[PDB]
Amino acid sequence: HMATLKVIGVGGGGNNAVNRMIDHGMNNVEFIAINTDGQALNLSKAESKIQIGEKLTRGLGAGANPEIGKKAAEESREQIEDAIQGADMVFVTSGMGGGTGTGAAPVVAKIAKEMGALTVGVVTRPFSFEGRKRQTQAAAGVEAMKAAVDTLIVIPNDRLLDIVDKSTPMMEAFKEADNVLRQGVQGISDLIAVSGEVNLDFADVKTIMSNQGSALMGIGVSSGENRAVEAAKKAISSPLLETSIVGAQGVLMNITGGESLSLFEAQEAADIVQDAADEDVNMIFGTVINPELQDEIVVTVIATGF
Ligand SMILES: C[C@@H](Oc1ccc(F)c(C(N)=O)c1F)c1nc(-c2ccc(C(F)(F)F)cc2)c(Br)o1
Ligand SMILES: Nc1nc2c(ncn2[C@@H]2O[C@H](COP(=O)(O)OP(=O)(O)O)[C@@H](O)[C@H]2O)c(=O)[nH]1
Ligand SMILES: [Ca+2]
């Protein structure tokens, strides 16, 4: 078994995220670009492009109307089905609060779910500076997404205002939000490709992520003294995500280190994650020894079930 991964951008923000992943290059991942706006879609370098709702919008965007996004996706349901064929895991990325993403992303997610793919949404909420209407439309989108996916990761754009200085370019801030999806997809790619000393596979991912709701995901990297505790604390901190680890009922956790990775430090790291989660957490723990590493360790966590 080698899980087929597809990453689907829906609407402007979603396609912005996909374009940055295409720019980096991600081997053994299929990228799909979905939009109402034909002009925007023509500029995408995704190898699979679906212009949705041409009869409805005449090739324009949805004008921030989620009903138009929804009806566009429904018009083009068969083309979406065709593009998703063969997927074992689908990431649907979209900015909530507009028209295309808000309306179409839940339709796309439900199609993926009903084809049997493990369906993960990674979505943003609008900045408060965009106003109450955008925020209310986005909230309805988030709820529709939660109903349609297996697991949802939500990034409030306001959290970007906590990690910038007064001069940080807008595009640099956007790259930070993008990195959540990109590093997530990279983690799954590594999990499916590499054989761990304590091995985790795609069935473990499904146990933790299938038919859940909101999730915390994070990665922590440290070296030197107290590296295990530091990396584990960083992994569970995830300042861009609205979901916290507190009370998590399911956890998939991996530790990657060099030959020096000690049993004592593995316990330290796992205890940090455990102490935060629910008393009866279903925790699946993995370990990889990468001999090319020296003093670095990397802790990766996804936490579900709240
Ligand atoms: C770092 C990677 O895990 C591994 C990589 C490489 C491996 F060899 C092994 C292993 N122990 O077999 C392993 F668990 C990983 N990826 C993830 C992960 C990544 C992304 C998500 C998602 F889908 F975005 F939410 C969920 C989980 C986790 Br927890 O751990
Ligand atoms: N973080 C981030 N948020 C974005 C980006 N583009 C758009 N957004 C957010 O996504 C929301 C919807 O915009 P957009 O996706 O362009 O609308 P749609 O094409 O109608 O789905 C906006 O209100 C913003 O909050 C982006 O590149 N990065
Ligand atoms: Ca593995």
Author numbering: 10 to 315
The paper states:
The filamentous temperature-sensitive Z (FtsZ) protein has been identified as a promising new target for the development of novel antibiotics. It is one of the most abundant and highly conserved cytoskeleton proteins among eubacteria, offering FtsZ inhibitors the potential for broad-spectrum antibacterial activity. Lastly, FtsZ is a “druggable” target whose function can be disrupted by small molecule targeting of a single site on the protein.
The only difference between the two compounds is the presence of a methyl group on the linker connecting the oxazole and difluorobenzamide rings of 2 that is absent in 1. The structure of the R enantiomer of 2 [(R)-2] in complex with SaFtsZ12–316 was determined at 1.4 Å resolution. An extra electron density was clearly observed in the cleft between the N- and C-terminus domains, which enabled us to determine the position and orientation of (R)-2 with an occupancy of 1.0. We have previously reported the structure of 1 in complex with SaFtsZ12–31621. Note that no SaFtsZ complexes were observed with the S enantiomer of 2, suggesting that SaFtsZ is selective for the R over the S enantiomer.
